């Protein structure tokens, strides 16, 4: 039937959308493909750990995976599992490999909580059309006191065993004349230090992160969506994912939707209508429903932007063998909180977090996620035969991405007479992972497949939200830009469209 606003999907852009219409009195329903996750599992908890992997890690897949840059030892805790509508879905395509959550709260469930604010000047270089003063003094600080950002004690850091890890890589990275920043987060850090004092059931502090946490995170459903259900104007129907969208003869939207089981067992397909139509499905999500309507003609009016100028935020990964006498520890927490950051908006720019490695005995190993400048941009392009998306994207368009990483590593390697570990990502040498992501952006990019707040180019009370507005790169971890964005887009839409 019939509802004021949909919103497709539970992630950040979805659930500040969600939080504002309901606030502004406009009844909303939010469909998510995945589950609720609130249910106790087997082992009484809610969400599997990484040393403990069962179906609840996996979106329909039939055996658990590894931590990538983990293998090595955790492939002994793998199993065959039944496909399931699991947390954590690995997406592939033909050249690259895009992880996203699903469930109510979409990403934030299975992240690693980093809130970090772009650095303006690159924000002014990706987004020129919009205004920094209003992002920069009012909505990147809304954005980063709703999702609940806080900030790590330092004496308790400094003394921790749990962050040995993020210690040693300060101090090798020290010797190349480099520093290292702090990274807020929203799992709360006053819980991770009762969890390593014994108080409180461990999370980050029991190898959990990628499959969901099961204390500390504060995830979305526990901050933005909360809130949007507490406004009484906000509902959200789960296992329910939208597969078509049209434009009704009188200017409104209707949608196909599909109702399936924990399983994937089709139990029905409704018909959904409304007026106002918001898409938080993802990068991925959002930009295959509009590729899919432009490509079997039910919006023939979407523009040729829809689809381009996607990039995986420069995501690389690598690793250094440490020397005997700088063990990184057995206990490392499963949340990062330091950075090295070498980002001056050059195409040598790399600002990496300092990874902790879930393994629990000791490795010598340091692990690192690069986020680099690396122009490559790909495309969705819709394939009518199996009516899937497909991401053009070849693994040589991460190669600026590799040499921006290689060479800053490089540089803490020589200062310290260390080598690559070039195993960790399977059999051939390979000590940089160039065909994964975390942080998938663009598809719908800002300003080019829609206006300037995210108005679909070519249709009236049509929306995008989510990530898939961010033109390929924004040289941090990308929740807090992705909310902050939300928060200004449909601030403008309620006042001049609703
Ligand atoms: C997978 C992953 C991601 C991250 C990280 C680790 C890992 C292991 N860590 S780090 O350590 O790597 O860095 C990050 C971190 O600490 N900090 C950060 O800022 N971002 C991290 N990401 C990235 C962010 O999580 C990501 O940028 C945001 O979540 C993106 O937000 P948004 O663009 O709003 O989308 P979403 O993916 O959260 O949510 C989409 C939801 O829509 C659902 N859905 C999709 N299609 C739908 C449809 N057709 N019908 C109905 N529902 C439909 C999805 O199921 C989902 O719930």
Redesign the pocket.
Known sequence: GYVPAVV????????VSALRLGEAGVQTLM????QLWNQPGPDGNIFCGMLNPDKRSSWFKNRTEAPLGSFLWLDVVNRNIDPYAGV??RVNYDQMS???????????????????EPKRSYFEEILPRVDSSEMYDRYFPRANSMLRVNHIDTKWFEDTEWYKFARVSREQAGKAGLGTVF?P?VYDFGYMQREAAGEVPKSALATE??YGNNHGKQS?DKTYLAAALGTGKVTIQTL????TIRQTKDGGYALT?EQKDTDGKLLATKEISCRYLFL???????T??LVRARDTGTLPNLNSEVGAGWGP?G?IMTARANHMWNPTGAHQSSI?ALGIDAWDNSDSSVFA?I?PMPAGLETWVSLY?AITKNPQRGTFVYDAATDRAKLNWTRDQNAPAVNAAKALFDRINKANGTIYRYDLFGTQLKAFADDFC????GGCVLGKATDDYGRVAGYKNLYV????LIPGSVG???????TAL?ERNVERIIKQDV
């Open positions: 497709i999907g539970t992630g950040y852009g979805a659930a469909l998510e493909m995945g954590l879905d895009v992880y996203v959550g699903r469930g109510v709260g979409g990403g934030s469930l299975v992240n690693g909580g980093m809130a970090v990274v987060n992160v990628i979305l329910h994912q939208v597969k939707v938080g499905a993802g990068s991925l999500g959002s295959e429903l935020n995501n990062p977090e990874a996620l975390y942080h998938p952006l939200t989510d990530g898939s941090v971890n990308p929740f807090v830009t992705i939300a």
